[PDB]
Design a protein around this ligand. Sequence first.
Ligand SMILES: [Cl-]
Length: 355
Amino acid sequence: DAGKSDLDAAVEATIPPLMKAKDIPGMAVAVLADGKAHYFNYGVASRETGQPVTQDTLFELGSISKTFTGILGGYALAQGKLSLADKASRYQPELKGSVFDRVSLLQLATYSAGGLPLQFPDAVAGQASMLAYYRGWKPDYAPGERRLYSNPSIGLFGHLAARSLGQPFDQAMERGLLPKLGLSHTFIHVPEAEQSRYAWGYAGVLDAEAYGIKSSAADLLKYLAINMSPPADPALQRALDASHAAYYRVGDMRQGLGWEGYRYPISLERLLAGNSNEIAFQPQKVEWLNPPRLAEGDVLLNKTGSTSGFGAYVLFVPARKVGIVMLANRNYPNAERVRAAYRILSAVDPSLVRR
Ligand SMILES: [Cl-]
C-alpha cells in the first residue's frame, strides 16, 4: 500500500504541473507495477468536443513505432528469413548495384549505414522515387562508423524485413505481428469503429515503419508487459530478445532494434543525455559489441515518440516488472517526458532514489 500511495503522489506531483506548464490538452498515463495496472487520465482527447481522455483513447506514438518495427525484424530473424549481417540488397533486387550491396541490415536498423538523413528529401514521394533515392545515395561515412538517427534507415530495415516475410509491411504488422502479440487496439490505420476514441493532436514514405503506429495507454501497457514477460511462442520470445539486445553503445545508451537501453539503476542526467537532441541530430561515434549482449545485469529500456501534434514516451525495467506509458496530444520536449517518468519510476523503485 505504501508503494501505491507513493505512485499516486508521484503522478499527482508531476503530470498536472507538466500539463499546465506546456498547455497539454490531455494525457493518458499508465503504470505497471507489482502485477497491477494503474491508469491516470487527465484532460481531453479533443479541445473541440471535450471528450475525456481514458486509457482506451488512441494517440499517435510517433517513433515508438520503431520498437514495433524492430520486433518485426527480430521475428523475421527468429524464423530464419533474414540475418542481421546480410547485405540490404539481398532482400530487394532493385537495390542491387547500389551502395546497399555494402550495407548490412544491422546497420540500417541501428541508423549506422553511413549518414542516411533524419527524413527523406522531398524528392521521395513514393515507391519509385524512394528506390531511386536509395540507389543514388552516397554515404558520408563508412558503414558502421557513425550513428545518425534516421527514418530512411530503420524504415528501409522494416521494409526489407517485411519482404523477407513475403508481405507488405502494413500487412506483416497489422495482420501478422500485432495479432500475434494480442494487441487489438494498436493500429497503423485507425479503423472507422475506433475513430470516436482517436485523440486530436495540437501544435508518407515508409511512415508505417518509422512513425505510424497509434495505440491506447492500456494497449501500450500490455505491450510493455509482453516485452518483459514474453508470451509462449518461441519465435516471438526470440524476436523480443533480438529487439532488446545491445548491438553498440553510444556512451551509456545501448542501441537495440528500435529500443534504446541503459544499465540500471541509471542517473537522471544520463537518461536525459541519451534522449537528447544532441544524440538524435548529430552523428555519433559508437562502440560495437561482439557478440550483441542480452544483459544479465539490470537494464532499463525506453523510447520517445513524437508527431506534429503528439508526444509519447515508454520505459520498462524487466528485472523490476515495471512499465510506464505516457501519451499526450501535444508534442512537448522529450526532456520533460524523461524527467516525469524518472520521478514516477523513483516512487515505485527504492533502488533509484537511493543513488
Ligand atoms: Cl489513421
